[PDB]
Design a protein around this ligand. Structure first.
Ligand SMILES: [Ca+2]
Length: 279
């Protein structure tokens, strides 16, 4: 399959070079897999989701995304125009309020919910979790991400937008999960993107165009935008039978584009997400 005039993000994860605008992917496109978006909720009624998105848990007065961040992350995972896996199932777990903030206890409880709610969903191809949040370091948040990873879910987390080492940020410091850095369309490390030895993969993070709330679309930046790229890629590689939950982050790093990113600090992996699809 080929999507012309696609955002630079998906075209990059399907290219060995920058500057292309065509996303190439296998027509399975994530069918049979599930991706849990743990954010500010998902506007499920957006036509770009085609009835594949739904709110399964909220810790507040409403499950509706009053912010747009969670809807933007879900659009990068599996929207019809801005998604990696255009056929996957999106489950919204609203652990952040409409202000984007959230207590660590609520966010931890959201991860434990996904570790058990996946037993209630139909995901024969695999379960992925997109954690496009994070804050200061916390062993409880790190253990909550490791528990979700040990339960059989591919956990992709954001490295953070502090331009520092991701070792002082949770769940970015958890070594068992996939810590995703950000990159721009010119194969440079995003100026805000965190780094360090704990990072596993870089993804398109700067000027990522995806869906917004109210049936609209907009372009934003952040490692919160590169995480759904890897999350959608893990679900894409899952239905194709290339990898499993405990080995997707390791497989993505193995088949990634090596030595193509600039401004990568010493000791940080120079890996960019690449679906390796040969049309
Ligand atoms: Ca890791």
């Amino acid at each position: 399959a080929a999507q012309t005039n696609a955002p630079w993000g998906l075209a990059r994860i399907s290219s060995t070079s920058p500057g292309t605008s065509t996303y190439y992917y296998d027509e399975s496109a994530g069918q049979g897999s599930c991706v849990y978006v743990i954010d500010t909720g998902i506007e499920a009624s957006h036509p770009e989701f085609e009835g594949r998105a739904q709110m399964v848990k909220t810790y507040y007065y409403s499950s509706r995304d009053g912010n747009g961040h969670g809807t933007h992350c879900a659009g990068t995972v599996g929207s019809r125009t801005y998604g990696v896996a255009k056929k996957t199932q999106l489950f919204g777990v609203k652990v952040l309020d409409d202000n984007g903030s959230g207590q660590y206890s609520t966010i931890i409880a959201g991860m434990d919910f996904v570790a058990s709610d996946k037993n209630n969903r139909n995901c024969p191809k695999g379960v992925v979790a997109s954690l496009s949040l994070g804050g200061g370091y916390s062993s409880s948040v790190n253990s909550a991400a490791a528990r979700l990873q040990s339960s059989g879910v591919m956990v992709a987390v954001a490295a953070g937008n502090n331009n520092a080492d991701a070792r002082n940020y949770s769940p970015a410091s958890e070594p068992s999960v996939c810590t995703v850095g950000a990159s721009d369309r010119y194969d440079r490390r995003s100026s805000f993107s965190n780094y360090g030895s704990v990072l596993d993969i870089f993804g398109p993070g700067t000027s990522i165009l995806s869906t917004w709330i109210g049936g609209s679309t907009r372009s934003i930046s952040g490692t919160s935008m590169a995480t759904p790229h890897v999350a959608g890629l893990a679900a894409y590689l899952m239905t194709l039978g290339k990898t499993t939950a405990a080995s997707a982050c390791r497989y993505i790093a193995d088949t990634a584009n090596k030595g193509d990113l600039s401004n990568i600090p010493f000791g940080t992996v120079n890996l960019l997400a690449y679906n390796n699809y040969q049309a």
